[PDB]
Design a protein around this nucleic acid. Sequence first.
RNA 1: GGAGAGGAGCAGGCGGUCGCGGGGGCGCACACCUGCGCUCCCGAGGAAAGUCCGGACUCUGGAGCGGGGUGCCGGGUAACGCCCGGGAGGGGUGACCCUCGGACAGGGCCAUAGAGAAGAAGACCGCCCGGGGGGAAACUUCCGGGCAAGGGUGGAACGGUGGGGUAAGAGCCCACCAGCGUCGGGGCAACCCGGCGGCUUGGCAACCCCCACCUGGAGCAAGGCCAAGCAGGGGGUUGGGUCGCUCCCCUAUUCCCCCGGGUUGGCCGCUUGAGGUGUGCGGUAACGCACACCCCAGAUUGAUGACCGCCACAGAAUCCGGCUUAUGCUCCUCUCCCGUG
RNA 2: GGCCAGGUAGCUCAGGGAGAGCACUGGAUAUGGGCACCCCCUAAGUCCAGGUGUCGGCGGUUCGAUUCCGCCCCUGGCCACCA
Length: 112
Amino acid sequence: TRRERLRLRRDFLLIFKEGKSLQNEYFVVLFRKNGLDYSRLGIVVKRKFGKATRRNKLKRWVREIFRRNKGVIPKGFDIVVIPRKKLSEEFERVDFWTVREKLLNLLKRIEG
RNA sequence: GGAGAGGAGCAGGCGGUCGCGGGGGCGCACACCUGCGCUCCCGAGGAAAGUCCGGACUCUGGAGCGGGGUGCCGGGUAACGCCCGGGAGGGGUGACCCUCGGACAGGGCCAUAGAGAAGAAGACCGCCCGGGGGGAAACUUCCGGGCAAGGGUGGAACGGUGGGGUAAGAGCCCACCAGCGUCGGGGCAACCCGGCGGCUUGGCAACCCCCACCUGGAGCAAGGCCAAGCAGGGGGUUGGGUCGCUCCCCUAUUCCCCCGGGUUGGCCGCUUGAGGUGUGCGGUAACGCACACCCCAGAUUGAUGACCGCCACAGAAUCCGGCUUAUGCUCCUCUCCCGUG
RNA sequence: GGCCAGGUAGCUCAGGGAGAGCACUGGAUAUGGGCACCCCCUAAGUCCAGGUGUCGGCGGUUCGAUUCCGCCCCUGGCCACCA
Ligand SMILES: [Mg+2]
Ligand SMILES: [Mg+2]
Ligand SMILES: [Mg+2]
Ligand SMILES: [Mg+2]
């Protein structure tokens, strides 16, 4: 859903500068009110996370978590998900349910 | 069965619940441009990779030189540093694998060790002859002369080993060998086979070089178009005109250089191509030709996931040909070895 | 996707027969300290002695390669339109 896909080239700077942030050991989540009746997701994966296979797997998991849990995630925010060094350190050791739990714990705390 | 060499294919599938990317069809709104909404088709790789070669395709005004690349020979190909076949040299019992022009065109470099390393250089331990001296002798000593043959030195010592011949010795002579020169035969050829002959005189060109062949340079962020927006200023014996050098066609601010500020939108390029698959024919093969069938990702923060059930390596970004590296199986050949019918 | 750089003692940097600087380990000795000397402790310093390496890895050429020729690994940077 590309209507659900927020542009990062223009908006990342604005969200970084004007928005809020939440984090845990695996993710940093940046967010800002978008003035819409729905939320939009963006993913920023640092080059150092790895090659296409690895980065694309992470992005797919993130997109899926967001899509399936859209109903419970707060509405009216532009959201940027950023994986942390730790995650890229035990990514192969971290299962899907753990990534889901850790990401949702942050997403559900987006206020207000 | 064991050990090993060459090579071909596949990339866990099939049946379920949700979620994407591009086409098509449809539902509709269309006073235009177009704007959404919901089924059929297709949707990462053998390496998509590293960017090591070769193209195609774009933009830079000409030509020459330099520079760079390839390196036995013959094909194949759009082309290549690739592929196929063949020739020499080497390794392995063997199937097989690896190597590749020229050092009497020239210049330069060979440390250390060693008597001597490029004109033929050299006498270290030595071998033999002719005298003078000492000494009973063995032996020592001095001068004159002859050896590259043994040993030592090396990565290599100016042909190799055996016999004859030498005072002692040398291709001095002869044998087989290696090299070179020729004559003759077979190959398109690289080269091979046979005969004759003095006696022959380092290595490195992944150093410059010589010979033969090929070759501008950038690169899809190439380049073309639309929309949007701010703000200009300082320079040019001229400089710049898609690497350098040399001659040459230009152009004078609108061009180029520096500082500063505006976008950090959308469309084209963007996928049908030296393209796959299936036969038939030619060719040792690589591959070519003929006919038939097919449409096989085109994203632009960048599309393939999660749950269930019987059994790796890693993700296209302009597209192809090949190389190299990363990696899980399965099958087909042939070689040697133990053991049996 | 493409195009360039660079990888040397721990760190910064030189350059076809492996070095400087900071630095570390010792010995010397207070004008520091146990008290005041004797005796002894500690070395910021100052003397001196050195300690030391797959040349980013793995092959090839060469009798020898930091230098030459291949590939692989790691670390940085550059690109688009407007005027
Ligand atoms: Mg059996
Ligand atoms: Mg690539
Ligand atoms: Mg000799
Ligand atoms: Mg440009």
